[PDB]
Design a protein around this ligand. Sequence first.
Ligand code: FAD
Ligand code: FAD
Ligand code: FAD
Ligand code: TPP
Ligand code: TPP
Ligand code: TPP
Ligand code: CL
Ligand code: CL
Ligand code: CL
Ligand code: MG
Ligand code: MG
Ligand code: MG
Lengths: 587, 587, 587
Amino acid sequence: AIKRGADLIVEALEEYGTEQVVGFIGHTSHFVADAFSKSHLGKRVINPATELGGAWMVNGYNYVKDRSAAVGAWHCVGNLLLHAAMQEARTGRIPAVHIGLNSDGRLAGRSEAAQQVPWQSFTPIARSTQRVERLDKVGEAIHEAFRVAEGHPAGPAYVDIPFDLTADQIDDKALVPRGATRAKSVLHAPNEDVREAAAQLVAAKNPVILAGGGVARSGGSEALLKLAEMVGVPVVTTSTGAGVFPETHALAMGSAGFCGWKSANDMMAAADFVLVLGSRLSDWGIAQGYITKMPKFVHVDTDPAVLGTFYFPLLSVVADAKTFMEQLIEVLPGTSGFKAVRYQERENFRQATEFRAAWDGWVREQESGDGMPASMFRAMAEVRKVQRPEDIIVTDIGNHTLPMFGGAILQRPRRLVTSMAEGILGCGFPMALGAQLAEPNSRVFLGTGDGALYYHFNEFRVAVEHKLPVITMVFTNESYGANWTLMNHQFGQNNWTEFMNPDWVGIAKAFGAYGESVRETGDIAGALQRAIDSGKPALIEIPVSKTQGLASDPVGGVGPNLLLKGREIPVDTGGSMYPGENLLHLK
Amino acid sequence: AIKRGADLIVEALEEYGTEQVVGFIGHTSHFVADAFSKSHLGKRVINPATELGGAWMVNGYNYVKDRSAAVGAWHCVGNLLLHAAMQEARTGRIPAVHIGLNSDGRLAGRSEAAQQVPWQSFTPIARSTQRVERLDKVGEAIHEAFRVAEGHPAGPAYVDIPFDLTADQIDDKALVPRGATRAKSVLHAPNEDVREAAAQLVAAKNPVILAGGGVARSGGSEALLKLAEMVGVPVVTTSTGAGVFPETHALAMGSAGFCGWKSANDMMAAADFVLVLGSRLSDWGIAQGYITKMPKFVHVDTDPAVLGTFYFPLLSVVADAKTFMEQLIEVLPGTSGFKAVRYQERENFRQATEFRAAWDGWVREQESGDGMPASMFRAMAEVRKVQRPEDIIVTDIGNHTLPMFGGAILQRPRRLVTSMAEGILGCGFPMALGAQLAEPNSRVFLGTGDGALYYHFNEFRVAVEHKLPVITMVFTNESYGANWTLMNHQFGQNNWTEFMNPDWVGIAKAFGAYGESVRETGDIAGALQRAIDSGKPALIEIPVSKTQGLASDPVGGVGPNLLLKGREIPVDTGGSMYPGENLLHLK
Amino acid sequence: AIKRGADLIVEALEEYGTEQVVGFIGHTSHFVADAFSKSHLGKRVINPATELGGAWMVNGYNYVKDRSAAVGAWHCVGNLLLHAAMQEARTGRIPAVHIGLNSDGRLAGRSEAAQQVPWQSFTPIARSTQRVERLDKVGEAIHEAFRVAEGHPAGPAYVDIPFDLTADQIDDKALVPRGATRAKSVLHAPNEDVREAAAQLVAAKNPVILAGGGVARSGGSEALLKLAEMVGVPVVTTSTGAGVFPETHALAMGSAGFCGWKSANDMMAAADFVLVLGSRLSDWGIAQGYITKMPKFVHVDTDPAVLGTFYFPLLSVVADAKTFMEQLIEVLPGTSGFKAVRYQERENFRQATEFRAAWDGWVREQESGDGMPASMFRAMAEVRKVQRPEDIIVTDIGNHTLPMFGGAILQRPRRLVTSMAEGILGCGFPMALGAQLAEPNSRVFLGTGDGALYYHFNEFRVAVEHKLPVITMVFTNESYGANWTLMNHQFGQNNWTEFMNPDWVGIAKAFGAYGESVRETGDIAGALQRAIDSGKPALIEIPVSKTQGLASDPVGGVGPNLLLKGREIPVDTGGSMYPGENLLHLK
Ligand SMILES: Cc1cc2nc3c(=O)[nH]c(=O)nc-3n(C[C@H](O)[C@H](O)[C@H](O)COP(=O)(O)OP(=O)(O)OC[C@H]3O[C@@H](n4cnc5c(N)ncnc54)[C@H](O)[C@@H]3O)c2cc1C
Ligand SMILES: Cc1cc2nc3c(=O)[nH]c(=O)nc-3n(C[C@H](O)[C@H](O)[C@H](O)COP(=O)(O)OP(=O)(O)OC[C@H]3O[C@@H](n4cnc5c(N)ncnc54)[C@H](O)[C@@H]3O)c2cc1C
Ligand SMILES: Cc1cc2nc3c(=O)[nH]c(=O)nc-3n(C[C@H](O)[C@H](O)[C@H](O)COP(=O)(O)OP(=O)(O)OC[C@H]3O[C@@H](n4cnc5c(N)ncnc54)[C@H](O)[C@@H]3O)c2cc1C
Ligand SMILES: Cc1ncc(C[n+]2csc(CCOP(=O)(O)OP(=O)(O)O)c2C)c(N)n1
Ligand SMILES: Cc1ncc(C[n+]2csc(CCOP(=O)(O)OP(=O)(O)O)c2C)c(N)n1
Ligand SMILES: Cc1ncc(C[n+]2csc(CCOP(=O)(O)OP(=O)(O)O)c2C)c(N)n1
Ligand SMILES: [Cl-]
Ligand SMILES: [Cl-]
Ligand SMILES: [Cl-]
Ligand SMILES: [Mg+2]
Ligand SMILES: [Mg+2]
Ligand SMILES: [Mg+2]
């Protein structure tokens, strides 16, 4: 059948499992938008206030789904706004396909052409960058994009299509590849390696299991619970793994790292052996700026590139996390020295429970005291009273990240969302909208700084039109508070940190969202109830200090090195000069 | 003397003429912010709501200054938001230096590193991209950046500096290059080329002088007035040249092009010879999608690359525009066939005056729409009543661009501002703030669509804190009106074009800006008076139709070909298959 | 201890298993060469006539070793010659680390600098490209290079180090990472998948096992022999897999593809099921220009990227080839319908033996006839009389490739060497020298075209000095014979194909190599004996036809499409013009 390139693009997106399109109109995307209006997918399209806001929605949706279920489709120059969100998708392992409709291929390369997008700008960012030259390659290019995006590692794929090809027509026989294939992901470890891990767990006096985001991607919660109880070993997570182990369990230490729980950092410092499952031991994660000292450890991952790049394990294993845990459960009875004992009776139990109890007591101290300014830990204690296991916690980047992570107590995977890998400010609100679109049965609670909310609050138009009832707490301190705090310490003076806020209640109301301030009332609990009952997106203005959180609260961190110290560097030797130095010797 | 890298950066920026810093804080920019606080540039640093908003401010400031007077200084991952504004600076010939402070060079290249910015993403966009490896190269790199940015062609330079080098210290002897000078820019044409151009001008029956943005950069307004009056030749401009010739003059036809004045398009269609001065004859400028038919023409530019790339001149000349005009003025009396006659008595005068009268009559007809919705041409007629010769007109991108360009009547150069080269939506409000910073005592009037204002209205924070009294008219139609209208024409249906507005007056009030709607009154005149009286940034909501402007108003354009018609393309031949086609051959 | 960067580079190369250095001197590699002279590795350095010749030696060495045992070390501008060999290493899956010593980092970025190598030229070619900015990163960068080079997929890594860092000194504590870690590669398939493969083999009426180069990397020869005999299934290879199954066995069909054995192409055309092990089903391999029709197939590979990119399998499996075969051997007794029967008694045996017998008879016909010009198949029959199982066959690219592949009958893996993935002319002689260096106990026989030998015969100085007794047959036809033959057919006329040869015997003798021509004697057998007995590198000049081989001999191929047919393409529509077309409408 004769088909337009635009129709073929939409067919290919349908073929590879697309559910949610985030699209922006312009003449180069006109044919694609018309094709979508005639398709199943057209029913769900989101048109964001800006392309970067929309790209953040794609990231939030796909982070919680672990596949490229959301896709971007963008008119030429709007692709120029994608880079920040695309970078997070790369290092944060978020599958995400973006289709850019460039200007006419006839005009490409002319020096005075308008809107000829430099697609090569994405080469260092996307895991796959393709410029489509020919109409008969559109299906093929989209097929490749999904294959790369949904691999190990997951990440973004960008496809640049000059828009004349979307208007052009061709016979469609076999053009869109049908019935795309996939190998099982349940990669099994060699039995020798499973035996070695079991022997190390037995021998250890105070072992820990460290579960990262790969346990979530693997679907390994059930196996992890069975394993941890069988051996009686405390469980630490990364921030993307939090919730794969119920965080109310006696063996739950929480997340290690600089915005994590002190119980987890205490356990990592005490442990004589770690079993690492599905973690990349990253800079702003377990490595803490490449300062953390790891105990001897076994490292199990599906991506060989993460194994041994920086921390050299005792034993490295390429395997699926769930599968490896199941193999270990089978081998343990039978391992020399293993005995079945209730975890509460193991010799290492008291230590771990003491670490957790000390952390819980400190958290309760931070929750104490009503009135203003509010403690962000108290705000999260109020959320917990109305929070269900399926509900999602979102944060932005700042002082506030630490209380959001410390007050999030999670029972299911993929319930904690931010720009994890790159710490890109402004992510929180649009990622929360993407997560809400993906998980319509979840309540989504966002704790955002004021400096953060400034970026993409224009997306309230999406939240209101599409009935996405995110509950946003905007923590106001009229500052980039992490930076105020750190610069005061570093230099004795903050600079570039202070700003004015609008009346955020008035902003919300101007969009038809629910708005309430607790500046005068302190009534966080009531505001949450009213926000929830409204059925609207909501904004609750909560004054906080400039200093509470990341830059100040002690959680047992060792890094990263935000307050780097300079070194005195020698000048160059040899006779070569600086530019312009000729004039100093005589002109 | 031993100095920190951050201090050396500030010294280099001061040496090369920086007047205004737009900066965003984070740990990687802490030392640079601290160093700026010790400089006279500190007192008035602009900290924008987002880095892309700030990069648009840099563009607006530098467009009106014709040098890199404003500079950007950005914490690592915030650099990822620069690309759209940087692309406009490249093709739009806006000098602009951006300093990106990357993460620690010690950590660069580690696969699980956080915030290691891919500076190579700028290579296809900036005119100069440099990664500084060594502290002793910081002065040298900044010297190079200004050299490239302020050359011919002008454009953006990006300098990536790992922030450890900003904390490190070194002896400073000769390190910052001092006393840089440029060659004079007053390039003279060969006398024979001047004589040939004079002979063509005098021989032509219906000549035109086409003056582009290069006449503004050259400072050629006085020479252009003398030349046009001496020979009695109508003047057409590009949109960046508008205002170099007073647009109230009898010989002023206005700007040619698809959002220009019909008088100019009429004149270009009638002309038998064109003298092109300081224009690149671009796609969305004079070329109109490479459809415009140029008469025989002489082409004078400082950049050899624009001469003969697409339109082949009768004679190409490398020269400064002002200088070439002065040369021509000198040779005209000695040119056979030249006679000194008042311009009003030349044979070609009546034709040109008829074209201008017909255009002016059409514009007047558009000023009497006079209901709700209001006419955008009426809004500009009201602006003109309170507009001085030094005041600046800004627009965004949409249906509204055409009435903004058509209602702008200018007497001085560099008074019309937008994303000229790339048409990037959202530019208008932050570019207007940048222009206002550059010229504190000029009045700045912005006409913006609603879809456009959605992008960067977060920068009201800057406008209110810094008391930048930009007068913004938001034209409301609850749509991307150009797209609504044109899709209805192309397909019989529009898709992706409609959205809800907030209460824009309420948004302004929530920020502390002046806000008023004329929906019930039509009182644009009174709203402008009250907005000006306020002394604040102002937002005036003006309801408009979905269709008025670019999509519906004929101005004699021929292109560009954006509603392109597809072609039927043959399938490939030979035996090669599509991916997945193997399955189709199984029996 | 205080160490120079040069000393640290050599320590790191030793740490990660380097055996063979191929290095080229110049001031930027002076410190590195001095450091090598004080190391174990210095004893084995090869200094090639050119850097591209040396890079081909690295490829030949590492192709046969399956690890980056050979490394390149190059003075600045000599790195500019690496790209061709580096590209083969990428697509041909050859591990290969190259260390480039650039010019002084102080001078980098200066516009009029000499010998500042553009290392970014390698970004699209190497699997890893690193520019080292800091002395304390030299060990780290080299560690990363080996990790990427020796992964799945294997490939080249390039490290660019400004040479000042090689002269600079630093305390060495912990700087070179010690005890680099690695996971086992014996990846096991899910038992369900092994069961499915067994069920498909049972059900099939005339199955085939297709073994590629991954079976060689895996070390799977023993398992493949046991499997093939147990099920009684014919074995086809790719050209990099040839020799993993003894090619004198009754079940050996040889290599499929356009330069392969007709018995293998016949079997692939007849088969109702294929088990593909360790093949990427490549363009100039099994795909034959994406024309080959695959029967339903199971595809087993360690690299998920090759699985389903173009040919969609019935079942895709991520597993090590040897391991998967061992799993299959265990499950087969017990699979419904499996019965133990001698392979000679299976119903499918006669068909396969008939295909092999027909091919062998055709090969014997091509060997018949002595005298001149010689048949290249007869030359290979003469080699076979003096060829041991450990010996290596090398070819270059041309008509001659087909008889080299068809006359190579191999019993062990990694005995067939060329530029497999990219077909880069000239590879053969230097790859043969690299293979000889790696396998000093092998006799190495090269069959090279004359056009090919012209490239790197300058490397005879290496062969003679280092006593590398490669036996080279130069097939003379005074032509690029593949192109003469194909162009005569395509156009009726050859162009750019003919050239003169030197007296190749005189060339060999001028280098101190053994030289002999059979132009007058026809005595191939005697020349081989004399060449072998000389103990020198040898060159035997053998006249051949312009036409025999790739471009003419029928081996059952279907592609690739060398003689592509053009299509008539429509002109563009719309009014836009070509550059310069303005002058045709009136100037
Ligand atoms: C301000 C801020 C503060 C932060 N604070 C912390 C903190 O305190 N603690 C913290 O941990 N992080 C923190 N982060 C997040 C951190 O930067 C990283 O994003 C995070 O630690 C990475 O998690 P991960 O190691 O589990 O790997 P992920 O990025 O989640 O990647 C998944 C890993 O699992 C592997 N994998 C995927 N699927 C499977 C499978 N089926 N089986 C096996 N392996 C699989 C992948 O190959 C990869 O190695 C912070 C971020 C910011 C911006
Ligand atoms: C929605 C939209 C509608 C538009 N409609 C129009 C329209 O109707 N008409 C129109 O003209 N544009 C229009 N534009 C703008 C257009 O895209 C270009 O930005 C503009 O036409 C370029 O102007 P220019 O040719 O004068 O060159 P500029 O981009 O202003 O560049 C300056 C030129 O002068 C040269 N130069 C610089 N200094 C000197 C010197 N000292 N002496 C000599 N030469 C010098 C430079 O080398 C260069 O060639 C539109 C843009 C948009 C987004
Ligand atoms: C002139 C010319 C003619 C040619 N003619 C032919 C021809 O007739 N026939 C032919 O076959 N080729 C031919 N070639 C070579 C061809 O271009 C390819 O180089 C070759 O076919 C690729 O072999 P392969 O598919 O086995 O994969 P390789 O390139 O050998 O790659 C190895 C594959 O095995 C996988 N792998 C690696 N280790 C393991 C492991 N442990 N377990 C499982 N999988 C593993 C890899 O991921 C990869 O998919 C020709 C080349 C030229 C230049
Ligand atoms: C795009 C971007 N720009 C700047 C930063 C630097 N940064 C990190 S945290 C932070 C403070 C954010 O302020 P806010 O959201 O108010 O949070 P607070 O620190 O006050 O809790 C900043 C500016 C960043 N990470 N990303
Ligand atoms: C970043 C970006 N995204 C999308 C577009 C495509 N575009 C061009 S004009 C336009 C309409 C803008 O709407 P508005 O500002 O309301 O103006 P109107 O057409 O209603 O006058 C759009 C979406 C663009 N040029 N840039
Ligand atoms: C670098 C390079 N240049 C050119 C070619 C194209 N090419 C492929 S085969 C061939 C013929 C080589 O001639 P020769 O070595 O004499 O072999 P013959 O065809 O005569 O057997 C040529 C020119 C190539 N593959 N690589
Ligand atoms: Cl547009
Ligand atoms: Cl940050
Ligand atoms: Cl040299
Ligand atoms: Mg804040
Ligand atoms: Mg609008
Ligand atoms: Mg030849």
